[PDB]
């Protein structure tokens, strides 16, 4: 149930991985080798609270994880996301022995 | 999802909404048993709502299983969000259909530019 401030029907968005120079740039000191950005530097369009742990897909493969920003759709304060290319071992051998 | 559109029903059906009372975050189904979401979404007891369009209306797809296993990466940084993963297991096996499915981890990283789907029932 959606509550006060959430949408009822989920919500969708094209939008594309950002480079890493460009993520660092935005969140300076913040960005570790497990997150990406994705998104717009204009702002306007973006994941926000009530997202987290939803995906981002692109070319049918699950590459993100819906984890912080400043705020939502600032500009220069893109999305940022668990780099889910990082952690197919860990995904894969904690399913394998659980 | 800020400056979006709405999915089209039920077309993202590897989406969950994670749900303790009300919906407070989102997942992906990656197998019948595990779906994938963010660490910092962790709570003791996680009520896994599939193959869901409206979250306040029965629409008759839904399958609501709650979590018999909830994991985080055990190297979760709470303050920086590093290592944002959580892994939940069902208690019983959800039902795959046309509705309800799984998607692909990657075989490789995305390259820069790559077009990406993003959803979720978060603030618009
Ligand atoms: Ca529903």
């Known amino acids: 149930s959606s509550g006060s401030s959430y949408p009822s029907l989920l919500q969708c968005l094209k939008a594309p991985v950002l480079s890493d120079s460009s993520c660092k740039s935005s969140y300076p000191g913040q960005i570790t080798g497990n997150m990406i950005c994705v998104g717009f530097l204009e702002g306007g369009k973006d994941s926000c609270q009530g997202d987290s742990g939803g995906p981002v897909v692109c070319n049918g493969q699950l590459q993100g994880i819906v984890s912080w920003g400043y705020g939502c759709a600032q500009k220069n304060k893109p999305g940022v996301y668990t780099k889910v290319c990082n952690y197919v071992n860990w995904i894969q051998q904690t399913i394998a022995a659980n | ?124």
């Not at chain 2, 909404?17 to 407070?24: A, E, I, K, Y």
């Open chain 2, 1 to 124: 999802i800020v400056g979006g559109y709405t999915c089209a029903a039920n077309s993202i059906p590897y989406q969950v909404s994670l749900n303790s009372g009300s919906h407070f975050c989102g997942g992906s189904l990656i197998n019948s048993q595990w779906v994938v979401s963010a660490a910092h979404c962790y709570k003791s007891r996680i009520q896994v709502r599939l193959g869901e369009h409206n979250i306040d209306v029965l629409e008759g797809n839904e399958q609501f299983i709650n979590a018999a296993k909830i994991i985080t990466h055990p190297n979760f940084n709470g303050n920086t969000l590093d290592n944002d993963i959580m892994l939940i297991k069902l208690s019983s096996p959800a039902t795959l259909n046309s509705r309800v499915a799984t998607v692909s981890l990657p075989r490789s990283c995305a390259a820069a530019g790559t077009e990406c789907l993003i959803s979720g029932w978060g603030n618009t």
